[PDB]
Amino acid sequence: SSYPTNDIAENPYWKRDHRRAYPQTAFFDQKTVTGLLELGSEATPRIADGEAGTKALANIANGGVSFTQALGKSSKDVIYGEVLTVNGLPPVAPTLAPKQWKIIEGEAAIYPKGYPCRTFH
Amino acid sequence: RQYGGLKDQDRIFQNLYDNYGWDLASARKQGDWYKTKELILKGDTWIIDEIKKSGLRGRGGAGFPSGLKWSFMNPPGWEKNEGPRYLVVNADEGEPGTCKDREIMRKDPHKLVEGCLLAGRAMNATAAYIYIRGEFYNEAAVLQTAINEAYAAGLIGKDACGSGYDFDVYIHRGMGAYVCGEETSLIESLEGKAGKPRLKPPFPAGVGLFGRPSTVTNVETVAVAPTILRRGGDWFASFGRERNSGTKLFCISGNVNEPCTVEEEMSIPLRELLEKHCGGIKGGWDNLLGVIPGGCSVPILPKNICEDVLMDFDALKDVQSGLGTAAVIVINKQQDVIRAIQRFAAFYKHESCGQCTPCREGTTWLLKAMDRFRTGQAKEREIDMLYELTKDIEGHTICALGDAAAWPIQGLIRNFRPEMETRMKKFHDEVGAVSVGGWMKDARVEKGKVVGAPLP
Amino acid sequence: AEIELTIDGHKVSIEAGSALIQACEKAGVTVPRYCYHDKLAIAGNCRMCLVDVERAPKPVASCAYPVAPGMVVRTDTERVKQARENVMEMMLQNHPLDCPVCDQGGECDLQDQSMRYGRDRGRFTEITGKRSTEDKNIGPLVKTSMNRCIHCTRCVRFANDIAGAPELGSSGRGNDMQIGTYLEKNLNTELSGNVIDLCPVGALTNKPY
Amino acid sequence: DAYDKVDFDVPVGMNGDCYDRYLIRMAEFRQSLRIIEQCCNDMPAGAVKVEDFKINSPPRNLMKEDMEALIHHFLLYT
Amino acid sequence: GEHALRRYPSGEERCIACKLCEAICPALAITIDAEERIDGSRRTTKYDIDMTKCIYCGYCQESCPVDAIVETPNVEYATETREELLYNKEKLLANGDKWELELQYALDADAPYR
Amino acid sequence: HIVSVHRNTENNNPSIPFEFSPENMKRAEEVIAKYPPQYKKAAVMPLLDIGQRQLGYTSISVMNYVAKLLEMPPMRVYEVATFYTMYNRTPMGRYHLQICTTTPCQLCGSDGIMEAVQNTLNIKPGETTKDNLFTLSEVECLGACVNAPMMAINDDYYEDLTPEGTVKLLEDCKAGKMPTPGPENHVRRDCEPASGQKVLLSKEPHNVADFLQEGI
Amino acid sequence: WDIVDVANRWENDLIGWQSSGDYMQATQMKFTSKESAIKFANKQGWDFYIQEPHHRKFRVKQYANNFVHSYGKLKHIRTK
Amino acid sequence: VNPADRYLQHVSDLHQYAKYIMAALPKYIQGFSVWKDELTLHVAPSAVIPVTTFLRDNTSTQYKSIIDITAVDYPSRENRFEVVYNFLSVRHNSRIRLKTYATEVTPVPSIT
């Protein structure tokens, strides 16, 4: 056993369980993305007058505006900040850990020159 | 403002050593039942508002203020209850260290009966039950003779003191259980069941003994009540600090030179308490290993702390401890603390009523661990473990016996960790090394019992 | 006639003066417990349904804490999870290793709540070990194996209240409390085979099955 | 599964034939033997199953001593 | 290999009918009926393995807390009928009889690793 | 320790009869009247004590008879007298040694007192003497903690003890003649310091009548 | 599915195996709502019976009920 | 340490990517869900063929390889089967899922 887990007295199990700390599927409708385009975000909220802000949320929550109307009403800075990248380019399909290849050519290769298989590392 | 050493005119009780006899005429010479007729004729609101001005804290160990405790008893529609209200006097003590309430009842059974009538008038109680310890046979006999003298004088009964107020003091004797010291277990033992504590949100001032409202007061804080109504609240409020007011009987026991019971001021230094009125310490102030203020249910104060500590509720709560019953059990340096707290844990294992699961399943585990730590059959980590198994009992129980059984273990681990490590290193180099639970590598379960290990 | 409070952010309305565990059951909040039952009296023995209540210093027992207005209840406090692990470990240290021979294998309330709320491992490893309770012959219909009793009083509360057979009870202090007739007296009632579905552990169980 | 910590190369053919599918199999033997050597040398100590007994079973030393672990053992299999 | 129901020292059947080998068996080969016997002890009336739908996963051996059923390393028991390949309680008690000297050697080297 | 489960061999039977003595019956009717006439059952605690004064111990005949007297089932008597330490349900001798062993007696030598008792006899702290005279019982705090090592015999406590005086106490009780009624070998009064009296050194008390509030 | 009289189970002559001729005895479905189960069951063309659930009646409990004052006969002894 | 903690930055990148993909084809993408570095686009059956071509043809996506496609029935839903498509862009080292629905008799169009 390892030390912070076989420990007789300092850990409780709820601090070190991770089966019960599983995260949920972030399910996003089309209308909650209209909410994120028009209300804003928790990082950058574009909402003033919070007591009226709940009512401003509620018509989108009932289906007041549409998504194409949300994209058309949205400013160029919003479209280039949160939908697009900051240069105006589409976001690249993300990968977790990128791999950069390096072909091994010389006498460290697995087959010498003249064989149609190369080692790629 | 040097707190301590009050004059002989400023003591509440004068029978505390039996110079003057417990007789009713001797109580008249002492000053009892002198103006009780007029005090009963005064309103209950005046008595409650006078005892609120004194700062009478609770003398049973909880410390809760008695004026606020007596005022919770009358919500403004109590008259719509239309029945009997009962008062209960907790004359059962069994707290290790204290003798103060046996000293109430043997010396002065009459200020008890007087304070019973006065506190029943303060809360409009119809009767009163005094719960004597069933061990205390001669104490119960002397109290019954004194209550009979009070019936014969007419100062108690159907027409108490010519004031049209009815009041009966009966005596109940509890055959040897210490969890019956708790107020609600006391109520259930008077009801005729087994004496187990009940849960909190049915408060006993709301609905209590016999399904009727009842509060439970200590026998001392009732025996102080008539003199503090006579002398006034302003005289009692002068002693002690601003919130901790007045005087208290202290039972100084353990290994002092001269064990005694005095009645002295609150907020007084422990050194001036032990040095000036009980000889000293057997061996001097060098010979102080630890001190337990209050009963068994208090953590130990170590040697450097207990030099400048005062004996109120504040200066002991500030050092993470309790005043309790203000029994002073000092522990000799030639005695062992681990054997002492093993005996305290065996006391709480014997005395638990056994109703809720963390208290009952806990003090058996605390005893199985303290026997093992007294022998020394452990690893260095298992006393950090014992700290955690104090913490898991400490606040999840019905009454405060689980809270009480937690605390001395916690004080031992906070103040005497190297004293336990020394015994454990001693066991590690007398005989072989030891695994968890006390198991040794030779230890195997043969037919029936376990051999290979010396079975603590 | 009703009281509105908050459990887990959920807002719930319940009839006045009820227990807090009925408010948790109404709001859908799952609270573990061993000595509470719908058809029986309230006792606070098992200490399992402790719960974080604003304006309370200690975790209060949710089965006997009455419902008050303006109440904010939280059940996912770290203190409540610690409390459930603590009380569960306390229950398990004198309860014997009888799960392959117990009759409540896939049915044990103590067992399914020990995965969900209790501790992973056990620190009970003394040489002196667990206590042992004498077996108590009650009758021909009820097999009785009282080492695996947790003293939830539920059989006693029932045979007192509803069955009307006052022969059951609890005699002792400390660990030496037992649940049985004191004299070894046979239990009759017209429904004595109902105490064996009632005990959450398998201490009172079926004799022909 | 700790293939990042272990160093190897990869053979990838150039013509899509059955012969370059052959030559890259012949070299993944080599790379696999390289894995086996680098993992024989760098094997650490410690536990071999996951930490907790709510998803896989306790050892038989422990579940015959532990009430908690007997409960977990009897539940992970029924 | 084939299956065996062991016995205690001084001869007692070891199978306390806990049904754990039945509940885990991925191909449903185990079938057990259990009754309380004359002593009041819990024992199996009927124990049975179908060896034509056993898959040799060893979960039945991993699951038993008493360690009552084990796998002997015998693979040389090939038969000529199906009826012979259905092992009741008696065939498996005779196997756990026969292989006990060998299962000592197996569980002296396995039991720490279990 | 507490041991509950009752054995039905001899001298503890529902069949063996029991009734109150008429003085005990008059005291029983006096004690039941202390409580409201509804809650008769609340007098279960003293009446068993009353039966314990008549018999040597609390049998099942006394618990069954008090249950018949009080309109109670007998299990409600069995719970109450099993929960309490003082209802000794086994027969003992005449004298019941109750040596306190809690820490304030332990710090002042109750080890020496218990050793000086069980050297004189040969019995264990749960064992009785074969003469049926003495019965050891180690006990927790008996309320006299200041009188630092002590014990109890029947209802009288004996305090401030030495291991040399304890064997003389036992030899006095082995001859029938009671040793003292007093609490010690005459070294103090009750709880006054052993040197003398530090406070309350007056001949007549101060009356409370001169120091009054003026509020009345 | 409700069982068939002849086809459910019968003890084997050989060993005592529970042999069946009914093949839907082990199948059992779970649905979210009652309406989804009815829609699927009459969509597949099946004759169904539906059984209504039974919840417990809400009755208000107090712990302080356990010891209320009895003016007349006690007619009960609680014990806890 | 929680093994879900190592994903969190890439899971945020996956969120921003999917919000872009929804803003690019608003006619055809009903929703999406990001679990833990797993992206799932939620699309109508008459919208299968226009989304898939996009996932093949846009240079930012380039989900060339089909990996595995299958169905799952939920009998409680009116549209009983859901049909899942898994793709892998071997350029960008990325995976993607596409979920549609179909009843027992009504179709979903083929991407073959």
Ligand SMILES: Cc1cc2nc3c(=O)[nH]c(=O)nc-3n(C[C@H](O)[C@H](O)[C@H](O)COP(=O)(O)O)c2cc1C
């Ligand atoms: C296990 C336990 C034992 C107790 N024993 C006593 C006792 O022996 N004497 C006493 O006066 N209070 C004792 N108390 C405190 C009682 O609850 C006390 O009567 C009440 O809390 C306060 O009474 P007071 O206002 O007079 O201080 C005990 C409490 C507990 C939890």
Ligand code: SF4
């Ligand atoms: S704390 Fe212990 S003695 Fe007190 S009520 Fe609870 S179980 Fe009983």
Ligand code: SF4
């Ligand atoms: S009742 Fe107790 S012993 Fe029996 S199976 Fe459940 S947890 Fe195990």
Ligand code: SF4
């Ligand atoms: S006998 Fe059963 S129901 Fe009764 S308290 Fe014990 S475990 Fe609970």
Ligand code: SF4
């Ligand atoms: S062989 Fe093992 S798992 Fe199978 S019934 Fe017997 S004890 Fe249980």
Ligand code: SF4
């Ligand atoms: S080896 Fe596997 S399939 Fe065979 S009886 Fe054991 S668990 Fe079942």
Ligand code: FES
């Ligand atoms: S169920 Fe609430 S504490 Fe036992």
Ligand code: FES
């Ligand atoms: S401590 Fe021994 S009698 Fe109180």
